[PDB]
From Swiss-Prot:
The gene is SLC9C1. Belongs to the monovalent cation:proton antiporter 1 (CPA1) transporter (TC 2.A.36) family. It comes from the Eukaryota. Residues 838-919 are annotated as: cNMP-binding domain. Residues 523-538 are annotated as: Interacts with the transport core domain. This is Sperm-specific sodium:proton exchanger. The chain holds residues 74 to 1193 of 1325 of the full protein. The lineage of its organism: Eukaryota, Metazoa, Echinodermata, Eleutherozoa, Echinozoa.
Length: 1044
């Protein structure tokens, strides 16, 4: 019967009791876990049964203790990190953690040698410094995440803690191998090779197994437990193989593996992602509880038998000197840390000095020192000093860091956050009052006690020179709360401009959050957009600019250069070799000759009759490479004569002929050069396009982030320009804000068009991914609203949700560069050319491809409409009278001009080399007259231009109801044009009509009270409409029926 199960269950129960009882106290639960472990240890020192239990558990081997507890803690520290904010400040975190750990371990070693009465040498003192310098702050990270601002400081602290733990265990292992278990001597070259092996092949092995784990997780669908077990087994196998088999630092491998797995969380399903987060947090909690209980037991059983008053004095002096040393390290690295993009202030420096909480890592290292030392007192001193430092740092640093965050002014709630929380609390209270008044007039819920219900449903406000600032901010508000007419003053004009800028920035932040909440923006795109908005909100008169937003879609770097260099590197015997199976066959021959190459290498290293005379000359060089691949498939002319890859293939075959004449002579260095050169050239020829695919994936990720940021800014500017009239009262400030917003919109649109033109195929791939993701999200919304209406039960809706989740996961594993379609495929995929194939054939026969270079004008402002222009290449600029817009590939120019037979509105000029499909107006009229079915060309063209001309009216009228542009377009897509010729050219507005827009022509309404001539949405006061049939008008209206 295992007593370890009893001890683990008792430690879990004690940790649960410690977490439950100490919710309100500022003392952490780990300190009272240590106290309970000490009580259990002295009980075990008295009672023999508890002695048996704690003897078979707490007297554990060091190696199994490390191999069990270190991977869980290290992987959870790496996996709980916010990896985007960590990698944005990776250089500062890395230099601070590495150099501060090195110099703090050196200073702690010097302090221990000069202070402690034990005659420790430099290596044991460096082991002591490596144990002491490892910090594990979790309460500081939780407090920094909870207390509003300084969100980047918590990420700095957590990343520095992760790298500090990893490199501290690395240097601890180095000095433990110097002191305790071996005593072997070596030369300087072997020491350099060992340091290089550890500090390089730790992260390299972690990166390799992390890429293998990401590739395995990317191809698992509808299987959560396989993903969870693959993550846990990958972590444990990485640490075990690295630490034992490869003799490398396994801790850095788990650090790199956790950082990469947290980086690539898109390969994991979201339910599996949140389960992995909760599961690894639970595992780290259990590991911390077990470590602290075992440490308390062994401290009060063995480490407390050798301690004097001088030991407690040295513990107090060690705590003070550790705090002073960490503060001096941060103070000496403050200018170097200040010259990064995120420079530390003095308050953040004091917080990071006082945030040095030693945790379970140093306790585990002291435990393995105590078990490794044996009967010597050095491990007892190590364990006692580490336990005292952990207790003192936890209690004093946690309580005084709560007090210090209160004192230093880093815990105050900001005024917009306070206002938003107060408004949310007021809205929740009003909703609860309306719900209570609804429930008080109910049938069943009328005898219920309402005092208890009002006491229970009482969610309140969490937040309960500053007064002068709040009074001034409330003073710059000439709103509806005070009705005094006046005239603008210049200082009042500056205050109104500042207030309008603040309202514009706040509404842009609201629009970005609305885009994120509807599954349109990405997480990192939303974070970057709100970061730019909150940066612009802190300056004097700076709006959210274009120059600081261009850095998101800066595709330039080493990756386009690598893409260009690799695509320049690679660009009836011909009929036989074109079958794309001969290359696969010879690559199979290469990969099956790779293993006897390794066999020949290891056999020549060792020297079975020499593995049967070296596999009889390696199967006579694989029958001289399958008779030189059947003499290069009997030879092929200039195709073999011009390729340099075929030239070193010829070099490989004549080197094989040199091997043949060597066998005729029957050298080892010649054979080694033969096999190495053959395998490296023939592997490089095959591994070039995989590097092309990797480079395409990296450019695809950067382009996806940049396109998401640009599209989010464009949609946010459109929403904030459609809600700008309510918030801004003065005309001049409104016009200035609209002017700067439209210039920013034009610049971002032109930049995104040129970004699409730079890399065509990758832009096509990311647009395809965004379109498929939007279609699947709307399908998921349809499934959810079908399930919520009761028309579909839970199991069938869950089957459909599993189907669309499998489709989304396979969309995540998309090709990174879809090749661009031909212009015939773009002419096929027009919105009004989607259905009818005969109309596709007629338009394709009647089209004409035209080439326009830079600077040429496609169409004028004043000339009559001569036809359409479907853009299949390049970017154009539409300048009209001031209407400015940039159109890209896929847009059609002149649809309403060729429908209404009107002169054009804008001049179309080229920004790049532009290819367009010019369908003539006569050809469009012939195609309109020929195709007159129930979906007709007139109906489809007028539906497309009706959607295009009716979305800004609906977005303007329903801006205050919280409708986005996507919801407005999806609501408008359910509509239909009314054939007015059937119903005597008069239409009646019924109650089923949700929104009715008149698209073209003039119309008369109600009892001929007035005339609605302009294209605009018809108001609710109109009951009936009458239409006239006149010359060159053709009145058309677009109605949308309600949901039936």
């Amino acid at each position: 019967a295992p007593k370890v199960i009893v001890f683990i269950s008792g430690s879990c129960l004690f940790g649960a009791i410690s977490r439950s009882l100490f919710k309100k106290l500022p003392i952490p639960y780990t300190v009272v876990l240590l106290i309970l472990g000490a009580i259990l240890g002295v009980v075990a020192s008295n009672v023999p049964l508890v002695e048996e239990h704690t003897r078979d558990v707490a007297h554990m081997d060091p190696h199994v203790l490390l191999q069990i507890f270190l991977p869980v803690l290290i992987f959870e520290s790496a996996f709980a990190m916010d990896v985007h904010t960590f990698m944005r400040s990776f250089s500062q975190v890395c230099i601070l953690a590495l150099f501060g750990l090195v110099v703090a371990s050196v200073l702690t070693a010097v302090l221990a040698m000069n202070l402690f009465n034990y005659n420790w040498n430099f290596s044991e003192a460096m082991m002591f410094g490596a144990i002491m310098s490892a910090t594990d702050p979790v309460a500081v990270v939780a407090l920094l995440k909870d207390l509003g601002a300084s969100k980047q400081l918590g990420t700095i602290i957590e990343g520095e803690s992760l790298l500090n733990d990893g490199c501290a265990i690395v240097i601890f292992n180095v000095f433990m191998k110097m002191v305790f278990f071996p005593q072997l001597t070596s030369t300087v070259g072997q020491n350099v090779l060992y340091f290089l092996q550890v500090a390089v092949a730790g992260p390299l092995w972690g990166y390799a197994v992390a890429k293998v784990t990401v590739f395995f997780l990317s191809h698992i669908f509808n299987d959560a437990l396989v993903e969870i077990t693959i993550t846990l087994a990958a972590t444990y196998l990485t640490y075990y193989i690295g630490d034992i088999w490869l003799e490398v630092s396994g801790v850095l491998a788990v650090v790199v593996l956790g950082l990469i797995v947290n980086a690539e969380k898109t390969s994991i399903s979201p339910e599996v992602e949140v389960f992995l987060h909760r599961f690894w947090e639970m595992l780290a909690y259990l590991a911390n509880t077990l470590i602290f209980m075992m440490v308390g037991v062994v401290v009060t059983q063995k480490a407390l038998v050798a301690v004097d008053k001088m030991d407690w004095f040295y513990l107090i002096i060690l705590y003070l000197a550790i705090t002073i040393i960490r503060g001096m390290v941060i103070s000496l690295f403050s200018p170097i840390l200040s010259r990064i993009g995120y420079g530390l202030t003095w308050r953040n420096a004091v917080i990071m000095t006082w945030g040095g909480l030693r945790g379970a890592v140093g306790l585990a290292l002291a435990l393995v020192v105590e078990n490794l030392a044996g009967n010597d007192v050095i491990g007892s001193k190590f364990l006692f000093h580490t336990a005292g430092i952990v207790v003192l740092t936890l209690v004093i640093n946690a309580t005084t860091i709560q007090t210090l965050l209160r004192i230093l002014g880093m815990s105050d709630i900001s005024i917009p956050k306070r206002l938003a929380m107060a408004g949310a609390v007021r809205r929740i209270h009003e909703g609860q009052n309306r719900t209570l008044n609804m429930l008080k007039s109910d049938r069943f819920l009328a005898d219920a006690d309402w005092d208890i219900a009002t006491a229970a449903c009482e969610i309140s406000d969490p937040y309960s020179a500053d007064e002068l600032t709040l009074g001034e901010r409330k003073s710059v508000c000439p709103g509806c709360k005070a009705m005094v007419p006046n005239e603008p003053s210049p200082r009042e004009f500056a205050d109104m401009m500042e207030e309008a800028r603040l309202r514009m920035l706040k509404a842009e932040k609201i629009s970005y959050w609305k885009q994120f909440e509807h599954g349109m923006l990405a997480r990192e795109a939303l974070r970057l957009l709100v970061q730019h908005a909150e940066v612009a909100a802190d300056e004097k008169d700076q709006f959210i600019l274009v120059d600081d937003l261009k850095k998101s879609w800066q595709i330039k770097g080493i990756y386009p250069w690598l893409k260009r260099k690799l695509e320049d590197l690679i660009s009836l015997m011909y009929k036989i070799c074109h079958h794309m199976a001969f290359e696969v066959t010879i690559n199979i021959a290469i990969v099956l000759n790779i293993v006897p190459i390794i066999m020949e290498f290891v056999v020549q290293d060792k020297m079975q009759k020499i593995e049967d005379a070296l596999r009889i000359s390696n199967y006579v060089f694989f029958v001289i490479y399958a008779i030189e691949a059947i003499v290069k498939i009997l030879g092929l002319g200039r195709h073999y004569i011009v390729s340099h890859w075929n030239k070193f293939d010829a070099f490989i075959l004549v080197v094989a002929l040199v091997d043949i004449i060597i066998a005729e002579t029957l050298k080892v260095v010649k054979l080694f050069r033969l096999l190495r050169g053959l395998r490296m050239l023939r592997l490089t020829k095959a591994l070039i396009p995989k590097l092309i695919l990797v480079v395409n994936g990296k450019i695809n990720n950067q382009l996806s982030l940049g396109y998401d940021v640009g599209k989010g800014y464009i949609i946010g500017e459109e929403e904030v320009g459609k809600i700008i009239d309510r918030m801004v009262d003065n005309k001049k400030i409104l016009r200035e804000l609209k002017h700067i917003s439209e210039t920013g919109r034009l610049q971002v649109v032109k930049e995104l068009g040129l970004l699409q033109r730079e890399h065509p195929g990758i832009a096509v791939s990311v647009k395809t991914r965004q379109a498929i993701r939007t279609i699947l999200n709307h399908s998921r919304e349809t499934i959810h609203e079908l399930q919520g209406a009761g028309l579909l039960d839970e199991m069938e809706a869950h089957k459909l949700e599993l189907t669309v989740e499998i489709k989304m996961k396979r969309l995540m594993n998309a090709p990174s560069s879809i090749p661009p379609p031909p212009p015939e495929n773009l002419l096929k995929n027009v919105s009004w050319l989607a259905g009818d194939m005969k109309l596709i054939d007629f338009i394709k026969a009647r089209a004409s491809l035209l080439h326009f270079d830079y600077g040429e004008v496609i169409v004028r402002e004043g000339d009559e409409s001569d036809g359409l222009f479907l853009i299949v290449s390049g970017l154009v600029k539409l300048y009209g009278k001031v209407f400015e817009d940039y159109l890209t590939v896929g847009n059609v120019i002149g649809e309403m001009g060729v429908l209404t037979k009107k002169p054009r509105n804008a001049t179309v000029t080229c920004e790049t080399t532009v290819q367009v499909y010019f369908i003539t107006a006569e050809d469009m009229n012939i195609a309109i007259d020929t195709f007159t079915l129930y979906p007709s060309l007139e109906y489809r063209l007028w539906r497309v231009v009706a959607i295009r001309i009716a979305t800004p009216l609906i977005m303007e009228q329903m801006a205050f109801q919280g409708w986005t542009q996507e919801k407005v377009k999806l609501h408008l897509e359910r509509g239909y044009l009314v054939d007015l010729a059937e119903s005597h050219f008069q239409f009646n507005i019924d109650a089923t009509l949700e929104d009715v827009i008149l698209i073209n022509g003039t119309a008369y309404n109600a009892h001929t009270r007035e005339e609605i001539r302009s294209p605009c949405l018809i108001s609710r006061t109109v009951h009936k409409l009458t239409f006239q049939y006149t010359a060159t008008e053709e009145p058309r209206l677009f109605v949308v029926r309600n949901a039936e």
